[PDB]
Design a protein around this ligand. Sequence first.
Ligand SMILES: *[C@@H]1O[C@H](CO)[C@@H](O)[C@H](O)[C@H]1NC(C)=O
Length: 345
Amino acid sequence: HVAHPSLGRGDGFPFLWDNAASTLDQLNGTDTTIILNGFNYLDRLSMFKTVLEGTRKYFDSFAPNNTANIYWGFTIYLNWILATGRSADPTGHTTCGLAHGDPMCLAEESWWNCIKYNPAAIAFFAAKKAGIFGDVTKTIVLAKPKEANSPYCSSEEECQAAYPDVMATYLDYFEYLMSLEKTGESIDMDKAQQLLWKAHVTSMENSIAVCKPRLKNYNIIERQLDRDYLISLLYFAATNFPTNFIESIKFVADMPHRQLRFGDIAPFIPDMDMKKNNLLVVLHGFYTVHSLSGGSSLTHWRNLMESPVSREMARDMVNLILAGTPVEVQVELAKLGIPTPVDYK
Ligand SMILES: *[C@@H]1O[C@H](CO)[C@@H](O)[C@H](O)[C@H]1NC(C)=O
């Protein structure tokens, strides 16, 4: 049995979904503690699953199997990074994540691991704080990184001190949910999604500089995909596109099913379908606009995205992208009010 990049265990749910904890009580620990290994796939899966189960009651009415839940996004992406080998050690110094080593191990040296750690772990703490799992007396004990002054925080307090904006934004999301018990209001989806994206973006923006050196562990083609993906995410986030199960599967199904290498030129990669080849072109399109505008296109984009009408029009562009419809990013952005930059070097 191996994790499928888009289908997880086979029907979209993550590889080993049933094996992950639904509640804190199913985790390992000692009567006074909870043990979680942040460098293990299953424990990282449980950091997502427990929040998903914990928040299921707010989304249950809308779709079967907690699929309307907007926590799915980075949960589905956990499976994709596993399945494509992107959580493994790219340096050759350990066998962490490799088939002949510990396949569940997530490497410190992995760029994907580096950027996705906080949305699993810090978010978990924030849910704990907000009361999503209930009263928790036991202390959470996280496995420590081997690197000195590592980007990976290993306790609630250390996480909070290292990345205070990331903790505060995920807290705001979970507090908003809890508040729905305190008032009986039905959830405002647009608002819940906007809060969750704000935390996601704050995390990315908090980890871009610290994780950046890990990009050199990959060949130039895979490395530019990483960059293209992170910059693109910031544009997608501003549209408030849903991060539920259906949309997250759609996304991963368009992402490359293996690490890129020298010789891969999108949209002409012959072991990939049209949707994967197109998306790679699109992600690089966002990168190019961003880069040639010196980042100023993202400031303009976020200003324009203060309008709900614009966000809706921008989501229609994202849907076109995910279906594989060829779009030139610069042309679509211009249409939505973004000055097209040109190369001045
Ligand atoms: C929930 O998921 C399982 C496995 O994917 C499936 O067999 C079942 O039909 C789903 N339940 C509903 C209510 O759709």
